[PDB]
Nucleic acid binder design. Structure first.
Ligand SMILES: [Hg+2]
Ligand SMILES: [Hg+2]
Lengths: 87, 85
DNA sequence: TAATTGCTGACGTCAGCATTA
DNA sequence: ATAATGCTGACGTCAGCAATT
């Protein structure tokens, strides 16, 4: 079965490929990789979405960090201005 | 041939005039399939370009928060100079 | 009221690079 | 040294949307 093909032990599978011709063995060995690849690619898509968002979220954080540091610059500059004049 | 993707509407329709309905259906599809193959290549290109622009966007920020930190720690000592005076 | 076009999200394939058994 | 596994970049199909024809 397709499902059973994807799911069995490295050994369990070998002990089940006995009667099948050698060229045929490879076809199903390729089928196992191909099938397993279908799974990996899916999981990769999810991960990529997570990674896309993460970078997006970093950017958000860096921007508010920029605002806040600018807001600090300005106030530290108000104090320097007022103290510069008295001095 | 596969340069079927090349010929324009006007060029193409006239090319089609010889063929049967069924043949037309087949060729028109191969065209969209071919045309789409190139479209996909475009979407990938367009994507790397804007993937980069984003990398630069972050890099310019990671540094912008440096001159800002340095600018504040500069204004710290400069404000104080006129504070202590 | 169609058809064609261009683009993009999502998939499944395949090649490569490690990592693991 | 083999074989298998998982992940990922890039690709080609296909669907379905938007905007032209
Ligand atoms: Hg990924
Ligand atoms: Hg794109």
């Amino acid at each position: 079965s397709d499902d059973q093909l994807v799911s069995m032990s490295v050994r369990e599978l070998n002990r089940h490929l006995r009667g099948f011709t050698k060229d045929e063995v490879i076809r199903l060995k390729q089928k196992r990789r191909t099938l397993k690849n279908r799974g990996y690619a899916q999981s990769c898509r999810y991960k990529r979405v997570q990674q896309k968002h993460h970078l997006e979220n970093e950017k958000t954080q860096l921007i508010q960090q920029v605002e806040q540091l600018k807001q600090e610059v300005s106030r530290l500059a108000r104090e320097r201005d007022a103290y510069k004049v008295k001095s």
